[PDB]
Amino acid sequence: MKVEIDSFSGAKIYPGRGTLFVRGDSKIFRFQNSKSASLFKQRKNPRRIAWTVLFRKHHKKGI
């Protein structure tokens, strides 16, 4: 199997878990759950959502 990464939060996606979304510019996004999927559809920036890997990498928290 392959363990994919969340396109919004960077969480690990196990097989059969979450959803996938193909945008009209032929780019693939993978969501581990409906929470990150709905934040993506609400167009929030993952650099400003405090629990994401990209936020913690930006803010040097636990790095």
Binding site: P15, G16, T19, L20, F21, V22, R23, G24, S26, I28
Partner: protein, 136 residues
Amino acid sequence: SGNGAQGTKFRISLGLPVGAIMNCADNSGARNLYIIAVKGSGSRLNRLPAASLGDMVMATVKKGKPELRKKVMPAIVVRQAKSWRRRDGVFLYFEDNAGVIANPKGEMKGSAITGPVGKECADLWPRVASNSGVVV
């Protein structure tokens, strides 16, 4: 589908009933396709015949070029936008409903496809896979 099927297809969750309008992905000059029928659909009282990705439908061009309007022609669904499950269990969906024009044997009226197509459609129709830019 029916006649021009290259192999079989697993059941995809039906997302396009009769009366649905989808974008027309090819370069044949048509803008949208209006679904009036699904090939191979069964019979149940009050149930609308619905289409999924890779299905061949009967459609009319509601908006587009006048030599394409006001007649029925076969079409092939290439983008579904209703989420369906594969046998590897990913749930996936596009962001719009889209199809292309074809004859009853399945070869495309147009020549190029804009945007992605599904692999369940590209495996089933080789001309769509031939003119398709990206297959996901």
